[PDB]
């Protein structure tokens, strides 16, 4: 459908009212089914209209115009629905031509810490609602963890690189509003072992299938067996994978044992039979001579001498029958024994070479979560799974910076302004910053509200880069402590000519040791110009930041030579190496669900702080200190769309507070 597909593109159920809607429309959701379908249609339709043309403001009037009866009947209902959507940033978000120019008379003052996507998204929304907004940014540029390298025609993202599908992604709307060159990623990714030899197709498929089965096993181990605590400590995903692997090694051994144990049971049947056949051959030999002697008494003989010949003859054909029946039973136990020797169980679970290739699939998982698997919560690492977008993953050939730079237009942004202290009281806030260039030049910003978009890395920093006065409550600081903030670096290799398969976007390099599985484990070509991006993931990321760009480009060229040959790999024209853990305006790459945390901490990070009263016995103050950023959005963490959506959320929560709902 069109109306139902607009609900889906807005991450809303088309046929049901959300918790947020129930809060703003209690009269409707608590009332009769008919009115709700009217609500749901008006909502779904308003969204459809915005999405069909997101380059110009959708006004209340424009909405009512294009609504057919009986849905245009109730004009207040349509006005409530339109206002809700506009406020919560489901319509008229991003960069659109405004119909009615914004009124010169501004209500309320907000300081936004950081001009990353979360910051910029919020700032636009608040200005749209007619608040006075100022962003304080420590860097000499906007975008934050969206960082794009540019020298001549060379263009390469050191931060966010990938749109993780357009199906329900609000970056779909932004891509129409801003010229981004979105290019699909071809899923074909050949591996190449330590030497330079592509993994054999049969083996590649075999390890990849084992990896998925190993993961699926950790989930079963987590949910069905409830193996989520061990020694009064939360179970890591790494721990669960070790334990699942060990149990697979145990089963390989247990299998061999049961197989050999049934070979000895057969060899001991055979021994018992051969012993019986040897003793019977002796009794046949002994009894044959007896008959030979008795029959060598030539006739004529009395009847006792005749009987002796006959009785011994009978007795000997009997024992010769038994031995022939036993020699049959011998033959079938020798067939059975030759079959068990022919069909042995597996010698080993995984060879040294298989374990190295499996370690690449673990590196890939350590890249995705930007952290060693030993840090990830087994139970909750994938807690955002149900909200993933549909459609092909794409890259920005333009460079992702095109997006923030666009969002920054028309906004009061103080660059080279490092927030040092955030003061919040019953009567308002003071934000104290300094010039990054000369730390002595001090600035004081007075505001009704502060929106903090400081990365979780910065919030974690001990001792603190930013002082809160009064200090943040235990419930907030405990969440900051618990939550994971990961690391993941990129090496940009700019060449003069393409020496790689230009229809292959990805290709892996398998590390020799487990300890270095992350080290330059993957290479991207996604750009018009000849550029390769090497990821440094897992435990490698932290360690490789203490090693110089020359040595890193060194290890890079080596690995590429091994695959393409010394004659094909030139010196690079330009090289850049990200060091995100050392970057003091990031202190890492993005959030992960650490062992001992859950999605619930993402919600704690998003809860605003309400100061105490100035004079005692004074009424409960309004909230002053708000939080946005990828670490604040439980359902879309560690993404640009997550940051974007977190900004829009806080802009609505602040407007509701300071302009009324």
């Amino acid at each position: 459908s069109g109306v139902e597909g607009a609900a889906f593109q807005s991450r809303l159920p088309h046929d049901r009212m959300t918790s947020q809607e129930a809060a703003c429309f209690p009269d409707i959701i608590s009332g009769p089914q008919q009115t709700q379908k009217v609500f749901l249609f008006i909502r779904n339709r308003t969204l459809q209209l915005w999405l069909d043309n997101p380059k110009i403001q959708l006004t209340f009037e424009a909405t009512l115009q294009q609504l057919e009866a009986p849905y245009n009947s109730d004009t207040v209902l349509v006005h409530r629905v339109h206002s809700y959507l506009e406020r919560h940033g489901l319509i008229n978000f991003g960069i659109y031509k405004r119909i009615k120019p914004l009124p010169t008379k501004k209500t309320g003052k907000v300081i936004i810490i950081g001009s990353g996507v979360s910051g910029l998204a919020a700032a636009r929304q608040l200005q749209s609602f007619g608040m006075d907004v100022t962003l304080l940014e420590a860097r000499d540029r906007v975008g934050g963890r969206v960082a794009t390298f540019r020298k001549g025609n060379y263009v390469a993202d050191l931060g966010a690189m990938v749109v993780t599908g357009l199906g329900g992604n609000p970056m779909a709307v932004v891509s129409k509003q801003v010229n981004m060159e979105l290019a699909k990623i071809k899923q074909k990714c050949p591996l190449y072992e330590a030497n330079g030899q592509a993994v054999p197709k049969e083996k590649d498929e075999m390890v990849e299938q084992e990896f998925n089965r190993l993961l699926e096993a950790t989930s079963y181990l987590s949910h069905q067996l409830d193996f989520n605590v061990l020694n009064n400590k939360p179970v890591s995903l790494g721990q669960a994978l070790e334990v699942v692997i060990q149990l697979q090694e145990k089963h390989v051994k247990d299998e061999q044992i049961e197989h050999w144990k049934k070979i000895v049971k057969t060899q001991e049947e055979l021994k018992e039979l051969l012993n019986k056949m040897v003793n019977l051959k002796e009794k046949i030999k002994e009894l044959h001579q007896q008959y030979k002697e008795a029959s060598e008494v030539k006739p004529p003989r009395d009847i006792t001498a005749e009987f002796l010949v006959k009785s011994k003859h009978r007795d000997l054909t009997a024992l010769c029958k038994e031995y022939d029946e036993l020699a049959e039973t011998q033959g079938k136990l020798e067939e059975k024994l030759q079959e068990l020797e022919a069909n042995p169980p597996s010698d080993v679970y995984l060879s040294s070479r298989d374990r190295q290739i499996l370690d690449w699939h673990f590196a890939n998982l350590e890249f995705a979560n930007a952290t060693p698997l030993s840090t990830l919560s087994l139970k909750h690492w994938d807690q955002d799974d149900d909200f993933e977008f549909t459609g092909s993953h794409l890259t920005v050939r333009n460079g992702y910076s095109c997006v923030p730079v666009a969002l920054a237009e028309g906004l009061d942004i103080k660059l080279n302004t490092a927030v040092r202290q955030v003061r919040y009281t019953a009567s308002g806030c003071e934000v104290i910053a300094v010039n990054t260039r000369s730390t002595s030049q001090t600035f004081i910003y007075k505001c009704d509200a502060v929106l903090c978009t400081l990365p979780l890395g910065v919030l974690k920093q001990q001792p603190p880069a930013v002082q809160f006065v009064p200090p943040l409550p235990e419930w907030k600081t405990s969440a900051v402590q618990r939550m994971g903030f990961g690391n993941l670096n990129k090496v940009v290799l700019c060449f003069d000519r393409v020496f790689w398969d230009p229809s292959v976007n990805l290709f892996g390099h398998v590390g020799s040791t487990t300890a270095s599985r992350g080290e330059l484990f993957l290479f991207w070509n996604l750009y018009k110009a000849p550029i390769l991006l090497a990821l440094v993931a897992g435990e490698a990321a932290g360690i490789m930041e203490n090693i110089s760009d020359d040595v890193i480009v060194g290890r890079c060229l080596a690995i590429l030579k091994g695959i393409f040959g010394s004659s094909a790999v030139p010196q690079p024209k330009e090289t850049v190496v990200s060091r995100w853990r050392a970057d003091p305006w990031a202190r890492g790459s993005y959030s992960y669900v650490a062992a001992g945390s859950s999605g619930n901490d993402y919600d704690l990070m998003a809860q605003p702080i309400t100061p105490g009263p100035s004079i005692p016995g004074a009424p409960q103050p309004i909230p002053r200190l708000f939080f946005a950023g990828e670490h604040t959005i439980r359902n879309y963490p560690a993404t640009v769309h997550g940051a974007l959506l977190s900004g829009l959320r806080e802009a609505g929560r602040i407007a509701d507070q300071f302009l009324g709902a």
């Binding site: 990938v162 993780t164 899923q187 990714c189 990849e208 890939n364 998982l365 890249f367 995705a368 979560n369 930007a370 690492w381 994938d382 955002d384 799974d385 993933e388 977008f389 990805l506 993957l522 992960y592 669900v593 963490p637 560690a638 993404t639």
Partner: peptide, 8 residues
């Protein structure tokens, strides 16, 4: 998170 995995 999971979303960022390659070869899915």
């Amino acid at each position: 998170p999971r979303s960022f995995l390659v070869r899915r």
